[PDB]
């Protein structure tokens, strides 16, 4: 099983059916995804060299799909296919104090113009991501790069920041969703749907951009849900039919744990359901 497409017109009843007996058919599909991609080696991520480069020792890129620092080429970051092309996203863990120069190096080399962050830095007193961009308008050195924040706009559920980066100038936009708790789901579908549509709008406005960066803490759950939502919301505009199973499957061929909880998988369905409810 690589794909379970569901006709737009069948979805409400289908999803009803999925949620029956305590999400019983849902848990089965989610369970079926469990081992996807997991036959692949993680050997470079496991070198002694690289140990301090990994936030979490069980969340490592596959050797086959890992992003490489041009060049010790090692970053915890994976290439991810999207609705439109094969290297559409780069997905990474929340930077560490000791890898934030690496992270900006990758951003520069890969021609990234848009970053999506869907974790906070510290949640319930637990560190999730370093505060890896400038704290104000003063320019900062990140290895061989200089970065300056040009603007920060704080909205209730996300904050958009514009940076200028120069090497030894590109404009970068950073879309930070602030209300998605780790291992959890946002409070509403409407919020993330609208954030997803905002980002994609700007992506469309970014001629020639490299991959879009998406990250959270480990770079798998909220990051994987974000991207799966981005992909299906495009399918809802182009197709008779949406393939939530297929999307998550695909993400898993490329990185462990993409969409990391059953509830995140349920939430993807709740999103598609509500969009279609709104249309009807």
Ligand X SMILES: Cc1nc(C(Cc2ccccc2)(Cc2ccc(NS(=O)(=O)O)cc2)c2noc(C)n2)no1
Residues comprising the binding site?
Answer: 182, 216-222, 260
- Identify whether 216 is a catalytic site residue: yes
Nearer to ligand X, 144 or 187 (CB): 187
- The distance of closest approach from Cβ of residue 148 to ligand X in the complex, given in angstroms and rounded to an integer, is 28
Residue ranges that bind ligand X, judged by CB under 6 A = 56-59, 119, 182-183, 216-223, 257, 260
- The distance of closest approach from Cβ of residue 94 to ligand X in the complex, given in angstroms and rounded to an integer, is 7
- The distance of closest approach from Cβ of residue 248 to ligand X in the complex, given in angstroms and rounded to an integer, is 14
Is the Cβ–Cβ distance between 215 and 117 less than 8 Å?
Answer: yes
Nearer to ligand X, 189 or 217 (CB): 217
Which residues lie closer than 8 Å to 37 by C-beta, 6 or more apart?
Answer: 62, 252, 253, 254, 255, 256
- The distance of closest approach from Cβ of residue 56 to ligand X in the complex, given in angstroms and rounded to an integer, is 4
**Sign of the Cα pseudo-torsion (251, 218, 179, 147, in order):** negative
- Residue 20 gets the label, from left (phi > 0), alpha (psi -120 to 50) or beta, of beta
Nearer to ligand X, 6 or 228 (CB): 228
Nearer to ligand X, 24 or 56 (CB): 56
* Annotated binding-site positions for substrate: 182, 216-222, 260
Which residues lie closer than 8 Å to 262 by C-beta, 6 or more apart?
Answer: 23, 26, 27, 30
Active-site residue, from 129, 166, 216, 263:
216
* Residues paired with residue 68 on neighbouring β-strands, in sequence order: 74
> Which positions are annotated as active-site residues?
216
């Amino acid at each position: 099983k690589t794909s379970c497409p569901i006709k737009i017109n069948q979805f409400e009843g289908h999803f009803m059916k999925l949620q029956a007996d305590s999400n019983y058919l849902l848990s089965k599909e989610y369970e079926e995804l469990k081992d996807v991609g997991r036959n692949q080696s993680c050997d470079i991520a496991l070198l002694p060299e690289n140990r301090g480069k990994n936030r979490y020792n069980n969340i490592l890129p596959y050797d086959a799909t890992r992003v490489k620092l041009s060049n010790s080429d090692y970053i915890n970051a994976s290439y991810i296919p999207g609705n439109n092309f094969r290297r559409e996203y780069i997905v990474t863990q929340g930077p560490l104090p000791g890898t934030k120069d690496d992270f900006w190096k990758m951003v520069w080399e890969q021609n990234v113009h848009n970053i999506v962050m869907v974790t906070q830095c510290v949640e319930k007193g637990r560190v999730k991501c370093d505060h890896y961009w400038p704290a104000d308008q003063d320019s900062l050195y990140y290895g061989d790069l200089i970065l300056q924040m040009l603007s920060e706009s704080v909205l209730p559920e996300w904050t958009i920041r514009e940076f200028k980066i120069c090497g030894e100038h590109r404009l970068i936009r950073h879309f930070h969703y602030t209300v998605w708790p780790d291992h959890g789901v946002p409070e509403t579908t409407q919020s993330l749907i609208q954030f997803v549509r905002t980002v994609r709008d700007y992506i469309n406005r970014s001629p020639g951009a490299g991959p879009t960066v998406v990250h959270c803490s480990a770079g798998v759950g909220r990051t994987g849900t974000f991207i799966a939502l981005d992909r299906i919301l495009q399918q809802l505009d182009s197709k008779d039919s949406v393939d939530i199973y297929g999307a998550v499957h695909d993400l898993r061929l490329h990185r462990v744990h993409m969409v990391q909880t059953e509830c995140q998988y349920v939430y993807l369905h709740q999103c598609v359901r509500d969009v279609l409810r709104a249309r009807k």
